[PDB]
Amino acid sequence: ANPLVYLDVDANGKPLGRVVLELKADVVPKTAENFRALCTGEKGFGYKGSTFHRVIPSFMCQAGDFTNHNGTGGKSIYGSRFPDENFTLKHVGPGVLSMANAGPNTNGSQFFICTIKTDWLDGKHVVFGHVIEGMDVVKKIESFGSKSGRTSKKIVITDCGQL
Ligand SMILES: NCCOCCNC(=O)[C@@H]1CCNC(=O)/C=C/C(=O)N2CCC[C@](Cc3ccccc3)(C2)C(=O)N[C@@H](Cc2ccc(C(=O)c3ccccc3)cc2)C(=O)NCc2ccccc2CC(=O)N1
């Protein structure tokens, strides 16, 4: 079965709730495993305590830069980056979970959750999961974003793991 993982998120130290994500290990096993292991911290590093550092209304909420917390960093469980596994799954609508990158073959740890259909990212960002519960939490995160992506409050993944 595809793994389910969670992100528990605060805004300014106030809980927003839990996002439940299904990882499509059937289609993108390697990309799904990276995210799963970063949620559990099993390699000695991962998402716990890091932030949603770029949140753009009517676009997406981006997180996972646990080295620099600013969108320039992060790393994968396989090394500093790994190639795009495939582009099979598409940016079909809100709730899509997809890998951030700095161009081709630069997947590390940064990821995003879409709040609209981001079809122009098809073939450029590897989709690997979807929100199955807590989309309302994602909408709360989105409400603290801005056109530049700078957040109005400190949005923190206080805990995460595998369900
Ligand atoms: N209301 C409606 C609004 O509609 C507007 C629509 N806007 C859209 O379509 C927009 C239009 C185009 N602008 C953008 O690309 C926005 C870019 C942006 O913010 N920075 C700020 C952060 C830094 C930069 C540049 C930089 C500087 C140093 C090192 C690396 C990059 C630029 C970046 O690029 N960092 C990646 C994140 C990442 C991910 C993984 C790694 C990594 O492991 C690694 C990389 C290399 C070697 C080893 C490891 C590093 C960085 C970033 O953030 N990628 C952008 C992104 C992220 C998620 C989803 C999509 C998109 C595309 C987008 O945003 N496209």
- Three-class DSSP labels, 16-51: EEEEEEEECCCCCHHHHHHHHHHHHCCCCCCCCCCE
Which amino acid is it at 102? A
The two tokens of residue 52 are 């949603």
126 with 28: CB under 8 angstroms? yes
Instruction: In whole angstroms, give the CA distance from residue 41 to residue 23.
Output: 16
Check if 34 has its Cβ closer than 6 Å to any atom of ligand 1: no
Instruction: In whole angstroms, give the CA distance from residue 151 to residue 135.
Output: 18
- The closest alpha carbon to 101, from 62, 138, 67, 129, belongs to 62
Residue carrying structure tokens 């059937």: 26
In angstroms, what is the resolution?
1.2
SS3 146: coil
SS3 117: coil
Residue numbers annotated as active site: 54, 59, 62, 101, 112, 121, 125
CA dist 64 → 1, 88, 100 (Å): 25, 22, 9
CB atoms within 10 A of CB 49: 13
Residue carrying structure tokens 């770029």: 54
CA dist 56 → 21, 25, 139, 161 (Å): 20, 28, 11, 25
Instruction: In whole angstroms, give the CA distance from residue 118 to residue 151.
Output: 20
Instruction: In whole angstroms, give the CA distance from residue 76 to residue 140.
Output: 27
Instruction: In whole angstroms, give the CA distance from residue 40 to residue 132.
Output: 19
Check if 111 has its Cβ closer than 6 Å to any atom of ligand 1: no
Instruction: In whole angstroms, give the CA distance from residue 55 to residue 155.
Output: 10
Check if 144 has its Cβ closer than 6 Å to any atom of ligand 1: no
Output the residue whose Cα is nearest ligand 1's atom 34.
102
The CA-CA-CA angle for residues 118, 141, 130, to 5°, reads 45
Chain breaks after residues in the chain, where C lies over 2.5 Å from next N:
none
* 160 beta partners: 7
Q: Residue 156: which residues within 8 A CB-CB, separation 6 or more?
A: 9, 10, 11, 13, 49, 50, 51, 52
Please report which helix (H) or strand (E) contains residue 140, including its range: helix 135-143
The two tokens of residue 27 are 């289609």
